[PDB]
Symmetry: D2
Subunit: 467 residues, 4 copies
């Protein structure tokens, strides 16, 4: 059941209703690539939920109370205070480049263990219940190998488990043992986990994981773009915390990490910004090095920073993001969409709190992988309902930078994400109806072939035509 | 069918979900009177749609571009320009007291015909397809009798007519004839009409009415709080204008009035403000007298006025209010609620575009009129779903100021109104489910009796208890 | 000395610099009447300080936190709470029509004493240290005569007194005695006083006045558009309160009135809104009648009200308006202008905290009163420096509504007011330089004569030409 | 002469007036380091003018009209359109990391000439009238040496020249010749130039420089954080453009560069954001590579971006920043401060449109360089007037990372910058009065010595005590 909105809509952004003929022309003009469509021509934009959600009245109002001082800003103080009261962390470093908090702490933590515990860079290995691509990216660079230690039930769509994002405790213990504690720069706890479309991590599991890290004195970083939704799943599924508030669950949760790194563009409800925070003095030197490195990150003095209003807004957003009614509503809507698609016969490879990955291959079996069936599905959804979704398949994968040949892809998926507090149950039903229509007319949808193809990052600007 | 929102939600006002026990206590604390409930304790507030709707991004942004000059304000110019371009009217007088545009033009038009056509105040009669209580109020005072000349189908809920708000053309011609053209100070065309919960007036009808007024040289005032919705019904139901835009229909519509008076708190999408405008020079002297009278309205110089930002916002709102997709969506939602209630057996005395008037008497037949069955229904709806609705029955009617006895009331109704772009289809279903529940438990709902009763306007602050 | 701004400028409204030739054309186009000039063509607009001042960041931000509920609004609660904490008054009635709080309490207080103390309407007399024209206006209507009981030093520009706004205590006692306590509906304490351009009232004086009113059980209304500036003058000049904060002085000050009526467009720093508040239960019935009368003010149900954001903004503005550094700065700037003009030989009939009234008659002795020397001075100031000021002389006075002849005027003054936190010391010097220039070229300035003259309120739209 | 503000102040940020005793305690608490002071305790913050200036009403309003779409955003379109209309550049890449536009184009341009003209990385040399430290920073890294080719009059404070920021034309021609055209990756034209506190570059000079670059087919990058002020100096001092508007001068100016890189936190009037733009198709491949590299800048997909409102605001700011009256006023204020300090005997090593560098060494001759006389001066200015300025001397310079010994510094300067449209002439006089006071009490000011010193970037968090 889709829950009623625990709020009154106060400000809206008008979106025009287009005709099928108009959309048919638009998609062609865009070279059969939704990435090239004007935002105005997209009725329901499911491209991403990162920074595309709505804000509350107080969050919006905060933007007008900014202190733009280079240092000692009361707006920076308000943000730090929110972090202290919510996560119990004493040190706060605002980030603006976005999820840009990892490019900072990774090199710092590596050097730390290397100078204190003779870490061997050529043998360094970092662990996580599931590294976010970017996190894994900044880690591999610097010469650090990553390893995901997720549980067996994680990707098993056939079995229902309450916390599929959980760390594989024995796996982690075994990994550190194998690699050697001196060569483990850090452990990243992602909540909720990005595995299988977004799955929660239990507090019991986090405690166990932290005890392991603590035993081997290994820094733990909480990747928390969705800290609030994880706290909600814990309240909903972990018996021990049934009567705890989201805030209490969050405070308890962060006792099991030494620092946190997060994009504020998800649960924190803001269009931009991020955080890199440290719990206490035990990590003051890591805080210093990070703050310092943040300035000379380029090898010399460079200056940037969120405007005062943005820090004031995030200071409020961290709290509004934890509203219990809001979280129940947000998650119920996502689940409502998934259940609705399942009912009409739409098959998903994986579906979680983050996104739903529809199997375009199975929906459009007649289209060869090289003809991008998921990109064809994206264009059809737009033609039919003006919906914009992103292909996560051969089109995105690209070609081998050494052979110029198409890279092999395991599945042709179409990703659906949901901007927070942006669309209603009616839009959800509209999406479901759209898929019902596509499934009914599947046999007629055509494959695609390039007319223009960039050498790199082709999914963003390539143009194609129907086969 | 409830249409999907032709917009993205951008700003929300959080509303807490309460427990039944909490609401039971709240309603008692409020003395069984929703008017006494804190806004925060109301989940779905259907008290009124006047100034309680959402605004668009551009409308909100306009508030920060105000020119606060006492005179020659560019913000006043922008508002006047919008009126000129939308209605084709050259003179604009912003009003702030709200629907406070009538207290001005009424006395002015009376004096006008009295000095030019020897109007006899003791025999003056004003006509309208249906006077809004307030309009009728300011008219009666000053010594002017009013007469509603609506068509036979207007209040016939058994027959479906496309324009139930239409003027009774023959009735109007007959009325002027009877009263004498010299004694008719003005004719008010209300669009959409407030009769039968809100019914549209056709352009054909307005033309016919204006021709009649024009023949007898009688000023026509367009009461247009819902000018956009009327324009939408014309586009939807009057064949001749099927392919016309809302803007074109509006421009054509206003050729059939000499001036307009309107609260901007409805279709214009703003929380405050109103307008009093004149079409052309033919009514320049009426404009002068109104503007002048607006200053010395109290018999001497008094100063007030909308802030610059408010005029800039209304200048944008007049346009956003005419968005075709928005209007289709707004009206479809209202109709969705009505149809849903009808399906579950809820009976309404009248239901239109403005509001739905549920017959509490029939829903709660065991409760005597003097025990306020519609006030009891309002309290039950709040207890069950946290909905706030207004009683329009014996409770509201009050007592005879000369006998102190309860005044007789024809029906015990509970009014439901819908704030624009505020609630979703899910809230609509929640309301319907609520009524389904009340209808199922109707026999147990108790009547009410005073514990505290003001001498006047008792519905606002009276307290009652269950019988 | 002009004090430095106790604030950082955060948002500005661009104003174009015009050429003399451009202004010469503009003033002619405007018919030698600044009231007809576009705001954009005025470089420094000294027309009025009512609602034309700047707001603080928090005040502006508050506009986006509004609760638009018809009743039980948390925004109304915040405003009431501010009044309770600042003035110690338990009952708050927001007004929007502006200074529209008097049209309500006057009739209510008259009827009160008439039913409780057999007040005789034909002999009713209200007193005040100095009634604001509007206040005096609403009072005279209803059949109530007013009497200003100001001290001898009040208008004596030759003598410097710390509190020229003080009540003439013996005069008041004598007046009540003469008129009879039963015929005194109320006493209005205006702070600061509008006499002599704005003069403060001491707390000692208010206490004494209240004791007198209390002895005769006569309601006291505090007209407080400038409550904060009066509190500042008390802190600055009344020895006993030298170390008291503005807030403490304000709380003490309001113990000496039974209710307050105020336009929020002055010291409260907002562009619109007003208040009508009652101290405690002793005046609950007056509160009820006022609230009630506010709804049926027209003899029947009429609905209006400030938007939620406006109440939230005023709730903050009441506090920001009391900032000590702000008040010192605001008042010092006004005094800086006055002192500067005096230095260059410009003579003022009266000059206080509210405004400066330059004697145009003495500055332009060659121009006959009937040729409006103060209107000629206003046009010259605009031509020379793009400044807009209002004439307070024969032009404004108008003609006798019974003889059509010009009414005699005691002096031809040009009023200068200063919008709060809007202009700088540089603009002040620019104004002074402008007057220096006019004084130097006084002999060449020409008188004016009508080319277009309205029958009423001619100063707003009349056009004139040079003689 | 300080010009009057060509605007009305509309929103203010309150700043408390502190006592000397309070400041004495604050500076000690801050360890004699203004960088450690709370913004709230600083009356006049001259730390930096980067992102600390005010915005116009329209710029602020734009923040509420954002389109947060990941791609095809109408807000991105508005920003691109502004760039096209103002600079005539067809390609726009918004940057958020701040002046972070250089870390992108530098590597791209190097690789370009290296693959097309066999550029030799070991011999690459980039030229500029004067590289901004950061620009020079990103350039040196990547293996590129930089060379400033400024004119002889540039740093000659004894001679007055209209365009001290001019390129040394012969020097540039000679440099390219020497280094070899194939080894010159690009030429950066900084306007206004950062040399000597900020000096303008003439259009004649830019044309000449571009012709040289064009002859050798070398890409020209216009570093334009202060494009508007440079355009103003050209209008003021370059005879040929005396009657040209700022917009016309800007359009002409950009014909002499192939692309532009700029921080929007200066002349563009916004608190955050930057731009990297390309003129036409001739540089489409450079645009692609930059855009592409902007995504995989970390060696893999990373996502960030300015929120829609921020792009809408910058789209307006680019225009408001060019207002002629504003620019004249802004520059006159800066010059007013410089002239005022010179009058009282304060000596500056260099003073321009960007900042004034007071020679603390000469002002406080008794304090040894190692005791940081400029840091002592900063603390004294704060104690005396609550002003915060930044030391640019031995304190900032730091120690040799190889000897741990203090690095030698040519002069001990105290930098003064002025946030745009933030402070008034009164604050300027307050600053001047402050220096007058310090100069009078110079002999008593004490030197400083560390109590806490970070290993790197010590100026930001080091604590010191008086000697
Ligand atoms: Cl706020
Ligand atoms: Cl806008
Ligand atoms: Mg900043
Ligand atoms: Mg106003
Ligand atoms: Mg309202
Ligand atoms: Mg974004």
């Amino acid at each position: 059941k889709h829950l009623p909105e625990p709020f009154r809509i106060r400000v809206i952004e008008p979106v025009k209703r287009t005709t099928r003929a108009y959309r048919e022309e638009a998609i062609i003009k865009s070279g059969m690539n939704p990435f090239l469509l004007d935002s105005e021509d997209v009725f329901i934009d499911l491209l991403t939920d990162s920074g595309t959600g709505a804000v509350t009245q107080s969050m919006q109002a905060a933007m007008m109370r900014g202190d733009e001082a280079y240092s000692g800003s009361r707006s920076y103080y308000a943000l730090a205070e929110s972090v202290k009261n919510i996560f119990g962390y004493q040190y706060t470093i605002p980030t603006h480049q976005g999820r840009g908090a990892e490019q900072i702490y990774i090199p710092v933590l590596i050097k730390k263990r290397e100078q204190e515990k003779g870490l061997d860079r050529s043998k360094m290995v970092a662990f996580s219940n599931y590294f976010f691509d970017t996190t894994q990216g900044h880690s591999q660079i610097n010469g650090c190998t990553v390893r995901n230690v997720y549980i067996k039930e994680a990707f098993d769509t056939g079995v229902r488990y309450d916390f599929k994002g959980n760390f594989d405790l024995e796996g982690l213990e075994r990994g550190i043992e194998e690699v050697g504690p001196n060569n483990v720069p850090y452990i990243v706890a992602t909540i909720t986990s990005n595995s299988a479309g977004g799955q929660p991590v239990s507090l019991a599991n986090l405690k166990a994981m932290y005890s392991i890290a603590k035993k081997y004195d290994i820094p733990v970083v909480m990747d928390s773009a969705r800290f609030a939704e994880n706290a909600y799943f814990i309240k909903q599924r972990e018996a021990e915390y049934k009567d705890w508030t989201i805030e209490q669950i969050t405070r308890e949760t962060y006792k099991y990490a030494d620092m946190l790194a997060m994009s504020a563009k998800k649960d924190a409800m803001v269009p931009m910004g991020g955080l890199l925070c440290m719990k206490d003095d035990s990590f003051f030197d890591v805080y210093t090095e990070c703050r310092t490195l943040s300035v000379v990150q380029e090898g010399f003095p460079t200056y940037g920073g969120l405007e005062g209003g943005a820090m004031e807004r995030l200071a409020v957003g961290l709290y509004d993001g934890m509203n219990l009614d809001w979280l129940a509503y947000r998650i119920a809507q996502v689940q409502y969409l998934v259940d609705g698609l399942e009912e009409i016969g739409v098959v998903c490879q994986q579906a979680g709190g983050h996104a739903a990955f529809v199997d375009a291959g199975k929906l459009l079996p007649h289209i060869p992988a090289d003809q991008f069936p998921a990109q064809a599905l994206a264009c059809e959804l737009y033609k039919v309902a003006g919906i914009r979704a992103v292909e996560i398949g051969s089109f995105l994968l690209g070609r081998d930078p050494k052979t110029g040949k198409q890279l092999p892809c395991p599945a042709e998926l179409l990703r659906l994400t949901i901007p927070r507090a942006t669309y209603t149950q009616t839009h959800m039903d509209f999406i479901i109806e759209a898929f019902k229509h596509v499934k009914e007319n599947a046999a007629n949808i055509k494959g695609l072939t390039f007319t223009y193809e960039p050498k790199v990052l082709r999914h963003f600007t390539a143009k194609l035509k129907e086969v």
